[PDB]
Design an enzyme around this catalytic site. Sequence first.
Site, mmCIF file in Angstrom:
data_model
loop_
_atom_site.group_PDB
_atom_site.id
_atom_site.type_symbol
_atom_site.label_atom_id
_atom_site.label_comp_id
_atom_site.label_asym_id
_atom_site.label_seq_id
_atom_site.Cartn_x
_atom_site.Cartn_y
_atom_site.Cartn_z
ATOM 1 N N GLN A 215 38.065 29.457 29.372
ATOM 2 C CA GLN A 215 38.369 29.153 30.776
ATOM 3 C C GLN A 215 37.297 28.201 31.305
ATOM 4 O O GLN A 215 37.533 27.433 32.264
ATOM 5 C CB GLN A 215 38.415 30.449 31.536
ATOM 6 C CG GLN A 215 37.200 31.256 31.385
ATOM 7 C CD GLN A 215 37.322 32.713 31.855
ATOM 8 O OE1 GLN A 215 37.406 33.629 30.967
ATOM 9 N NE2 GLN A 215 37.271 32.949 33.098
ATOM 10 N N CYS B 110 40.280 33.806 34.109
ATOM 11 C CA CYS B 110 40.755 34.712 33.011
ATOM 12 C C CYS B 110 42.093 35.304 33.357
ATOM 13 O O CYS B 110 42.919 35.562 32.411
ATOM 14 C CB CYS B 110 39.631 35.820 32.747
ATOM 15 S SG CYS B 110 39.151 36.398 34.361
ATOM 16 N N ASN C 248 39.519 37.601 24.292
ATOM 17 C CA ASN C 248 38.690 37.152 25.422
ATOM 18 C C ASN C 248 38.954 35.686 25.770
ATOM 19 O O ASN C 248 39.251 34.858 24.881
ATOM 20 C CB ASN C 248 37.194 37.344 25.080
ATOM 21 C CG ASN C 248 36.333 37.259 26.316
ATOM 22 O OD1 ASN C 248 36.975 37.563 27.512
ATOM 23 N ND2 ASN C 248 35.166 36.894 26.333
ATOM 24 N N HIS D 40 37.184 41.548 35.298
ATOM 25 C CA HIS D 40 37.491 40.481 34.333
ATOM 26 C C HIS D 40 38.761 40.933 33.604
ATOM 27 O O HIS D 40 38.896 42.115 33.223
ATOM 28 C CB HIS D 40 36.296 40.299 33.395
ATOM 29 C CG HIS D 40 36.441 39.179 32.395
ATOM 30 N ND1 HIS D 40 36.979 37.944 32.739
ATOM 31 C CD2 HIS D 40 36.151 39.109 31.069
ATOM 32 C CE1 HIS D 40 37.007 37.183 31.662
ATOM 33 N NE2 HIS D 40 36.491 37.857 30.655
#
EC number: 3.4.22.2
Length: 212
Positions: free
Chosen positions: A19, A25, A175, A159
């Site tokens: 990102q 995210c 991730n 997150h």
Amino acid sequence: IPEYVDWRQKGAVTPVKNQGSCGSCWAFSAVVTIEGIIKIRTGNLNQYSEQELLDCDRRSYGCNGGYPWSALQLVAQYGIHYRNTYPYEGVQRYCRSREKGPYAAKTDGVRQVQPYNQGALLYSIANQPVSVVLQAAGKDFQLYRGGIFVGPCGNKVDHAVAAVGYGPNYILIKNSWGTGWGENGYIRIKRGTGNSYGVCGLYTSSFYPVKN
């Protein structure tokens, strides 16, 4: 409900991405969600634009805040483009959706998994990947360069990432950082401990579109 669930070797998830210096995210987590399902029926793996989700979703706060569960909803409602006809740049801007032309991908609904229930998370993750949140503001999860994260960490979710498999004991997560984190952009957290919330609050609020 296999003892092992990996969608990677299933041809459901594409390469890893970042990102960057963009707090986005949520849109990335989504693109992976929709993506997965999109390939689960049609048998066509695709990379959709998160950038679009950023510039279009005004309900979310683009480059710094959002709801993985607006993005999806959005798509289902409208749609979403490829990551070629709307590659990621890292900065929120004017919606190009319309200007871009005809959509390429569009779901048929969004549903949420009953928070705080591993048993439930898995099932859905078994039928198709899902967007999940957790504590990353972590100073440990931030340093993870491979392993099974147990902590320490907290219950202050903030997150969003993605689950793309689990084992008798480890849950697999994609991730939104570079492949210069965890185990090649991947990180294995531990399940079955009693922690209802789930370590790092990975059991707070999860989601996913629908497809016919």
